Design a protein around this motif. Sequence first.
Motif, short mmCIF file in Angstrom:
data_model
loop_
_atom_site.label_atom_id
_atom_site.label_comp_id
_atom_site.label_asym_id
_atom_site.label_seq_id
_atom_site.Cartn_x
_atom_site.Cartn_y
_atom_site.Cartn_z
N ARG A 167 0.83 -1.20 0.00
CA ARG A 167 0.00 0.00 0.00
C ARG A 167 0.87 1.26 0.00
O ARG A 167 1.45 1.62 1.02
N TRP A 168 0.94 1.92 -1.15
CA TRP A 168 1.74 3.13 -1.28
C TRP A 168 0.85 4.32 -1.63
O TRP A 168 -0.37 4.21 -1.68
N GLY A 169 1.48 5.47 -1.87
CA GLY A 169 0.74 6.67 -2.21
C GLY A 169 1.43 7.51 -3.26
O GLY A 169 2.53 7.18 -3.72
N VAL A 204 -2.80 2.68 -6.01
CA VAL A 204 -1.59 2.73 -5.21
C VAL A 204 -1.51 1.54 -4.25
O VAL A 204 -0.77 1.58 -3.26
N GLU A 205 -2.27 0.50 -4.54
CA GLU A 205 -2.29 -0.70 -3.71
C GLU A 205 -2.59 -1.94 -4.54
O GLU A 205 -3.59 -1.99 -5.26
N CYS A 206 -1.72 -2.94 -4.44
CA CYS A 206 -1.89 -4.18 -5.18
C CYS A 206 -1.46 -5.38 -4.34
O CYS A 206 -1.10 -5.24 -3.17
N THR A 207 -1.49 -6.56 -4.95
CA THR A 207 -1.10 -7.79 -4.26
C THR A 207 -0.20 -8.65 -5.13
O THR A 207 -0.62 -9.15 -6.17
N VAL A 208 1.04 -8.82 -4.70
CA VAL A 208 2.01 -9.62 -5.44
C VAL A 208 1.82 -11.11 -5.16
O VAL A 208 1.34 -11.49 -4.09
N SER A 209 2.19 -11.94 -6.13
CA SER A 209 2.06 -13.39 -5.98
C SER A 209 3.16 -14.11 -6.74
O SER A 209 3.99 -13.49 -7.40
N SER A 210 3.17 -15.44 -6.65
CA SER A 210 4.18 -16.25 -7.32
C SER A 210 5.54 -16.08 -6.67
O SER A 210 6.57 -16.02 -7.35
N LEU A 211 5.55 -15.99 -5.34
CA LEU A 211 6.80 -15.82 -4.60
C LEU A 211 7.08 -17.04 -3.73
O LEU A 211 6.32 -18.01 -3.73
N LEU A 212 8.18 -16.99 -2.99
CA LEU A 212 8.57 -18.09 -2.11
C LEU A 212 8.44 -17.70 -0.65
O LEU A 212 8.82 -16.60 -0.24
N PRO A 213 7.88 -18.61 0.17
CA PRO A 213 7.70 -18.37 1.60
C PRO A 213 9.02 -18.35 2.36
O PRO A 213 10.02 -18.90 1.91
N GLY A 214 9.01 -17.72 3.53
CA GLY A 214 10.21 -17.63 4.34
C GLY A 214 11.37 -17.00 3.59
O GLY A 214 12.53 -17.23 3.93
N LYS A 215 11.05 -16.20 2.58
CA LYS A 215 12.07 -15.53 1.78
C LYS A 215 11.77 -14.05 1.65
O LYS A 215 10.61 -13.64 1.53
N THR A 216 12.82 -13.23 1.66
CA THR A 216 12.66 -11.79 1.53
C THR A 216 12.62 -11.36 0.07
O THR A 216 13.08 -12.08 -0.81
N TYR A 217 12.07 -10.18 -0.18
CA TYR A 217 11.97 -9.65 -1.54
C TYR A 217 11.99 -8.13 -1.53
O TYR A 217 11.18 -7.48 -0.87
#
Length: 110
Positions: free
Chosen positions: A29-31, A65-78
């Motif tokens: 969530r950004w602006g 200004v707000e979305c939802t990312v997917s297709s990532l790996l758990p317990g991992k930073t991004y």
Amino acid sequence: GSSGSSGPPGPCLPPRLQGRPKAKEIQLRWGPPLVDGGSPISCYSVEMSPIEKDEPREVYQGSEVECTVSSLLPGKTYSFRLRAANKMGFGPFSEKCDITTAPGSGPSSG
């Protein structure tokens, strides 16, 4: 009194992780930036990249200004970034915000 000429928006701010992250997904969530290069923003672009490896790729792009990312790996930073665009063009990305996904858990709801 005009000074010179319009242009791309300055360096926007980093997106704030919305609510709580997921295993392979994450909400942000950004602006709107303070320096729109003089012109009213038109569309933003969020480029996410795995801190582990420099692989930045537009994961989102729209007027919101707000979305939802997917297709990532758990317990991992991004490392996520933010950039606005106007009639002039796209500007520089924001501060790479590192977000750690969930360790992988949750009930069975569908």
